[PDB]
Amino acid sequence: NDWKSQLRRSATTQALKKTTTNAEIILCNDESLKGLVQYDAFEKVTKLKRLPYWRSKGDANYYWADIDTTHVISHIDKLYNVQFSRDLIDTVIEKEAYQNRFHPIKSMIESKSWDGIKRIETLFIDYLGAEDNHYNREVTKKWMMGAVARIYQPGIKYDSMIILYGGQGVGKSTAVSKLGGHWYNQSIKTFKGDEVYKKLQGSWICEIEELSAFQKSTIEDIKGFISAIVDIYRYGKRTERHPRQCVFVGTTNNYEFLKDQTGNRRFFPITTDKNKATKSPFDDLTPVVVQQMFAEARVYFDENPTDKALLLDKEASEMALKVQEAHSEKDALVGEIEEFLE
């Protein structure tokens, strides 16, 4: 039977009422408008399930826009003699998308289960020529667990940050981009203010690249930025974007990038070398392998879904202290004073 009988029309006039349920029925039953919106939960936006009939065949812009609302209103009014306000149609579209919501990262991580291969520990070791050290394995594993935890337990306490040191072409940025995929982000250069939290909307793995030496202020800025676990933005209810799914990785050119003693214990440097990388990050980091690595991280984190499980091992942390001292400025004056005292 036709769905027209479901529409609520005014008894006196037998004309459709400009009502939320009428719009819901039309959007969920009209052939031209049937199920062409969905909710990108990670990006917190309204994407298109399919191209509507008012777009070009090869537009490749799968985001709902204002003119899509214009065309929806025009089509509804053309077929059905009811003129819906733009606010009502936007509200109905938002609700319908939220009903058909999905998570792309949660889909990819669970796209395929994890067989036993143990890829999480040798992420940057065999791809960027790092050292087969306990600290490297532990911190890379904990970083991948932190990434998948921020995906699954969105608002979580994970203030650590892998920092990769290497030459101009060791492929650290390439490897980070391969890991991030569509949700990799590098277009973040300032870290203090309010609008920065808007730049994190569709980003999962955010990379901070240090070409020239950062100023003393920028290090404190990135500390206070990665230390946050919540973001606040905005048309009512203040829409506190609590999740903060982002996980941060830095890529530095200078060997000695640590200046303050405050920043230590949170920046976990890894020294990447070339000619010793078993697998080329330009050819071997494929979506299948990174998906399997994230599935392995999911398994390990789900073995203990807690922020305390994202912290390093005790001996791993104590020798991370040694690494952080080996990557910091020396101040060169304690030795001279020691010689004077001796």
Added chain:
Amino acid sequence: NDWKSQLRRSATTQALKKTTTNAEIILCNDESLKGLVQYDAFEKVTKLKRLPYWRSKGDANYYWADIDTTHVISHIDKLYNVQFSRDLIDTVIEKEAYQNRFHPIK
């Protein structure tokens, strides 16, 4: 008496009027909307007492957002064909939360 008989209905046209008392009665006496908001007195925001039926079970987000008001308006319209305003529903939600206000630290 059934709570639906308390609703103030326009005697001329036998339709519910978009008044604040009707919204308050519906929110206080609807199983899908019975007492799902509260007011945090420390951080001045409205939070969720429980999880509404339109939210995923593994949500862990307890901030009342615009989509929650959208779903409240849509559900009230579906059940009682009233079509309350966005601002009126926000006002009634805020009043209901303030009726169940709390201080988290206290």
